[PDB]
Write a protein that binds this ligand. Structure first.
Ligand SMILES: O=C(O)Cc1c[nH]c2ccccc12
Ligand SMILES: O=C(O)Cc1c[nH]c2ccccc12
Lengths: 379, 115, 379, 115
């Protein structure tokens, strides 16, 4: 059972997020302040300056030598039980595809832990669960959103060879992509070219246009393009320098000086109120809140709020979590959909309606669902 | 099949001679005709020459060599020739064909040299 | 004399402001991140949401019953010695105009006290001078930027009658402006109309077009248009509700609850890092930093940094300030040009180059000038 | 001078009569000729009728009453008349002149009534 004052600490940490979100839904839908080109300049700022400094602020204050490794294995066994059953679904059943393996992995295992999970669980359970949610944000940024980037690059590099080398691709020796090309999925004309050698060998060169390969060829092609999406990504620099500093700042006690700890904190203090303002600007620019259909908005919000936590009840118990760490682990799994899984689905067109329903409609029912777990778990 | 291009016809020739290059296509799937030809000096910024495209209706000749390079298709032999006349001295570059079966497959072996 | 550790507290509070400003000058001029239409969506956000919540946060935490009234009279005697000599210059000398009386009043008496004066003087002298700078921000928002709004409305309402009633205006009885018109200075076609009555009287109606009056007539016309610029202004609501709450929160000790004190603090914490980001976006969109000429950029920065403080040395001493309150009063007068005096000069075209030089070029020499006062005053 | 407009010519008249309105300008500065005329019913959204503008070169007649309303200027008397013919029954509105001396000065006194 919960006390009525502990319900006030949740509202103290969550109602400020929805105030910032309805003021931005109002300033576009209702009172017409922002032009949709002006409105896309605030999303630009948040995606590059505010969230990479908000995620730096949390990761650099983490202690990487005192991470709860029993709690941390229950979150990384959710994402193996899910990802094994998807691997044993696309290979067995003939209707399974790789476009749904990426969608069902985002919809069921990757929540919004950074902007709404750290403020939410800090009010519900205290300062330790706001320290455990930082440890998940470290592992999503550095492992699970950099695996999911391999699954989009593999999805792009498999279409281009099935469309253009349908009967010859068994003889490709190397694939060189020109350095101009960043995404080879449905965006650029991509004049590819092959080089027939003296014995059936084949050198492929993907170029920019104007007017089954061996696994040693594809896994050289994927790692090139993953590297070109990883150094242009602003949250890799937030995650590299955040982990590099906290491995130094917590062994030799080197406290970061107040020139630099305040130069970062002048834009990172913007980051949490600007993320919710940017998220409410996005749900106003879309024509419908439920966009994917009503039979798929009940599917996007059953993978998230039911299949999400019910696979961390078979994983958080097999690891050995009990008490409050079981209750923190289930409630963090029922958080709404993270936005970085949508940002990949917008770029690659792997169901951008289901992953925009689940972000937008997930936020609106996020609070009365996680409060429903917070009542049922304590009883 | 292990599909293979064969190119020949290149050699040493003076200005104003006559050449007829070869592009022997063999081993392909269903070939949509977009067999091209272009030049390549050791300097960059290459430029396209000809085409024998879809029905032989219109070819794409370059503006400098328009109407003087004769291109022709034999679907039975699967070989497209390129006849050259009034050979200008800026033709020492390599001339190789670019058959398009969805991805442009091309070879390298000629020695078109005009002195 | 100053100690070398007290120089570090100034850099701790000022270098974070220039980091946020050069990242925005870089993201437009150098690395081309923001389109100038995207770049005008961040200025929109800061001008409406971030600075009215930053100025609310400071005013609502002020104690209006414990304001230093001796210090506060030295700032309001600067702006009378300046404003008397300008009144006795336009009336005596025939070359004097009203377009320069508004310019020389902004350039010499209205600094940037909100965004760079409260962080600067808090590091230099302590927590009391960061409490004295809030007391000046209250008086600029509620008195001096609402007098200066009368001088722009009077400048607009005097042009329209001199242009259109050149020989008849001595007989105007009333001037009714239609409610569509907000600014009648060089923006709208403004089909005015008069109504000749039975005895030479004249009723004037200013309308929207498609394809010496008595002082009881002008001071009814000015107060209408001042009221229509004052309820559409976002920093009047910041200043009304900030003073109304602090008159309640400091007499009956009513501490503001943490639903509302955190709903305001989620966007107001953005406000100081977003103001410096927005100010650096503005100096990148302009073609030249010194824009008014070099003979006027030495004039904009001699009224601010010399005539500014040297008229608070004859006013702060006539009131009776000595010691540190004399030194706080001179250093706050040497702050660079406030941005709200520029925002009026952009709308009304009363020298928008001198008041954009003085904001932009004033910031760049703000730190080595106020540090030059901070060394010379203590010696 | 205390400048004053004088308007007359209005009265009760049946359909298809004839009217000639008056606009007596007296007391002005140098008058740039933009003397207008327009209708005003108690309903809103008024509509302009005529002009006697700068040189009398082109007037601006409305599209419904084009060519049928005769407007004329006498600079000596400083009075512009508006002749009306084939009086349609939708002419009960008030018809007053709008002399433009930089700001449009106008009066109110007529009784143009068509039954
Ligand atoms: O960092 C990004 O790419 C965007 C992003 C991640 N979490 C967010 C929460 C709110 C708004 C935007 C984001
Ligand atoms: O509030 C405004 O109208 C704009 C404004 C006032 N002070 C500022 C400091 C930095 C950036 C913008 C502003």
């Amino acid at each position: 059972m919960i006390t009525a004052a502990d319900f006030y600490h949740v509202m103290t940490a969550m109602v400020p997020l929805y105030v910032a979100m309805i003021l931005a839904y109002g300033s576009v839908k209702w009172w017409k302040i922002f032009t949709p080109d002006q409105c896309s300049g605030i999303n630009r700022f948040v995606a590059l300056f505010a969230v990479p400094l908000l995620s730096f602020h949390f990761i650099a204050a983490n202690n990487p030598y005192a991470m709860n490794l029993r709690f941390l294995a229950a979150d990384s066994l959710q994402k193996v039980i899910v990802l094994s059953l998807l691997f044993l679904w696309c290979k067995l059943s003939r209707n399974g595809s790789l476009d749904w393996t990426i969608t069902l992995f985002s919809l069921s295992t990757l929540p919004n832990t950074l902007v709404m999970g750290i403020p939410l669980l800090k009010g519900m359970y205290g300062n330790f669960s706001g320290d455990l949610m930082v440890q998940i944000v470290v592992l999503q940024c550095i492992i699970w959103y950099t695996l999911m980037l391999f699954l989009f690059e593999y999805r792009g590099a498999k279409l281009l060879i099935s469309e253009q080398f349908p009967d010859t691709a068994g003889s490709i020796v190397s694939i060189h992509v020109d350095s101009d090309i960043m995404s080879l999925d449905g965006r650029q004309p991509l004049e590819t070219e092959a080089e027939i050698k003296e014995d059936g060998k084949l050198h492929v060169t993907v170029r920019r246009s104007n007017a089954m390969p061996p696994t040693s060829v594809m896994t050289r092609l994927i790692l090139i393009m993953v590297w070109r999406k990883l150094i242009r990504n602003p949250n890799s620099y937030s995650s590299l320098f955040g982990i590099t500093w906290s491995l130094i700042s917590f062994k030799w006690n080197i406290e970061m000086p107040a020139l630099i700890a305040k130069s970062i904190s002048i834009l990172s203090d913007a980051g949490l109120g600007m993320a919710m303002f940017s998220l409410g600007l996005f749900m106003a620019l879309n024509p419908r809140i439920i966009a994917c259909g009503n039979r798929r908005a009940a599917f996007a919000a059953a993978m998230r709020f039911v299949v999400g936590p019910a696979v961390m009840l078979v994983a958080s118990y097999a690891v050995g979590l009990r008490g409050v760490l079981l209750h923190v682990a289930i409630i963090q799994a029922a958080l709404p959909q993270g936005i970085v899984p949508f940002v990949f689905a917008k770029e690659y067109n792997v169901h951008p309606d289901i992953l925009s329903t689940a972000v937008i409609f997930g936020m609106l029912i996020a609070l009365p669902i996680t409060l429903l777990y917070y009542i049922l778990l304590g009883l | 099949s292990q599909v293979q291009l064969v190119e020949s016809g290149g050699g040493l020739v003076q200005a104003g001679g006559s050449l007829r290059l070869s592009c022997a296509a063999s081993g392909f799937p269903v070939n949509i005709s977009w067999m091209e030809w272009y030049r390549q000096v050791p300097g960059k910024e290459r430029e396209w020459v000809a085409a024998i495209q879809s029905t032989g209706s219109y070819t794409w000749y370059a503006d400098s060599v328009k109407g003087r390079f004769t291109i022709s298709r034999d679907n039975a032999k699967n070989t497209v020739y390129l006849q050259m006349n009034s050979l200008k001295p800026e033709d020492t570059a390599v001339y190789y064909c670019r058959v398009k079966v969805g991805a442009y497959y091309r070879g390298q072996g000629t020695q078109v040299t005009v002195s």
